[PDB]
Amino acid sequence: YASLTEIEHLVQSVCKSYRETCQLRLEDLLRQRSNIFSREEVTGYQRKSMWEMWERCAHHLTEAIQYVVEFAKRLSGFMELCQNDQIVLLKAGAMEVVLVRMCRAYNADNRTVFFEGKYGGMELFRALGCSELISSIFDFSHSLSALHFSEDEIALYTALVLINAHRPGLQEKRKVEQLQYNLELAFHHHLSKTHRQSILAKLPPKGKLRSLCSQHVERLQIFQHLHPIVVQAAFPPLYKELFST
């Protein structure tokens, strides 16, 4: 039964955990927004082989996932969970957190995302051969940018995305429930103080993040089936573990 003091302390603890593991500073992402891919560069990306484009993406995604794992390690209560629960939560949630975090690198004004040192539109990703998945992620990032998340709001929300007592395979289901509930109290308290509880009904529907992650895994299957050597040889081991079927 966490007190108001303890709840306020959880708010600060979560926000600090996030701040220390946010990968790129928001200031930098914003200052880089004028740095956009030239038409020559865009053409170059579209002319890239499918294998090279997937391999690049797998690397960047793995990098982003590593910061999420670190976020989890610093998140109050997570390391107190049993090793099996930690895995279940991260295996199901890491990519979901990355997708939420990604909205920070999305510029809604010109519909671009920060990728490989510059900003680029969705036409940059043609060579992957999953235009639907790409458009879906771009749309999702657009939906989220409209909410104008603060860094603190991202911290609290992504903590909840990770700490989900409804993930299949949890041993200490009740210990995860208790952590989830306290993080919800932390989130709702933070929102009430800043008069931002309106965003709660505007957050992604209960199966949207699940859908995007399933789509990703599926498009990887289409890729991997046709290019099985490259995945074995050059893709990050962690990436295969999380996504290869």
């Binding site: 590593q66 989890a72 090793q83 895995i87 573990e241």
Partner: peptide
């Protein structure tokens, strides 16, 4: 799993 190793 590699997640185990990363968690330490």
């Amino acid at each position: 799993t590699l997640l185990q190793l990363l968690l330490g």
